[PDB]
Design a binder for this molecule. Structure first.
Ligand SMILES: C[S@](=O)CC[C@H](N)C(=O)O
Length: 205
């Protein structure tokens, strides 16, 4: 049992890699939310926004810390009607709602600009296509294939904490030192630890 935040802040690849680099974030998935059609998809998006579902351990990171990361990944100071990329916070309860509203007020005071992020109730979140998940990792072929065999397949891999961290590492959002600690948590057999580590070290160059 973990806590859930659902945010929208533009194309979801960067957010996936950024939030997935953070201690306390257990898993991420990208998808679509905020519209009024069931089962949207990339070429049939309707009025939905590109969104990220963050599953986090509230004992380790708070919703307030996640909102602060959210507002540091983009600066939503213009009003657009482009639903696919609109800045939105989908609250799952009234505590999330009030923390978001308060933090939005603080930001507007501290920097002087109106924030256009819509703070709205989460209705339905729909998972994006598999090719959008852990996008940087998926497109780093050897590392991906190795990790995928270790986790037992695509679904198990992309739902894992280590994939979230690896994806963030490839994207440039996590140090190799922190990544290595994460690899340590998984307790791989020595040989697999070494295969993964040499790919990762080769990526650092
Ligand atoms: C998920 S974003 O809307 C897609 C952006 C585009 N395919 C690109 O590679 O630049």
């Amino acid at each position: 049992k973990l806590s859930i935040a659902v945010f929208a802040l533009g194309c979801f690849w960067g957010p996936d890699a950024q939030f997935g680099s953070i201690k306390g974030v257990v898993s991420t998935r990208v998808g679509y939310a905020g519209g009024t059609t069931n089962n949207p998809s990339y070429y049939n998006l309707g009025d939905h926004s590109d969104s990220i579902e963050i599953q986090y351990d509230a004992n380790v990171i708070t919703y307030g810390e996640l909102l602060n990361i959210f507002w540091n990944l983009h600066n939503p100071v213009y009003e657009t009607t482009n639903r696919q990329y609109m800045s939105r916070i989908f609250y799952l309860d009234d505590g999330q709602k009030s923390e978001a509203l308060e933090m939005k007020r603080q930001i507007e005071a501290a920097n002087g600009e109106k924030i256009y992020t819509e703070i709205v109730p989460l209705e339905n979140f729909y998972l994006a296509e598999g090719y959008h998940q852990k996008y940087y990792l998926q497109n780093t072929t050897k590392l991906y294939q190795t990790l995928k065999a270790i986790y037992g397949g695509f679904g198990n891999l992309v739902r894992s904490t280590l994939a979230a961290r690896m994806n963030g590492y490839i994207a440039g959002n996590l140090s190799i030192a922190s990544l290595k600690e994460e690899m340590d948590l998984v307790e791989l057999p020595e040989d697999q630890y070494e295969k993964v580590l040499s790919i990762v070290e080769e990526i650092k160059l």
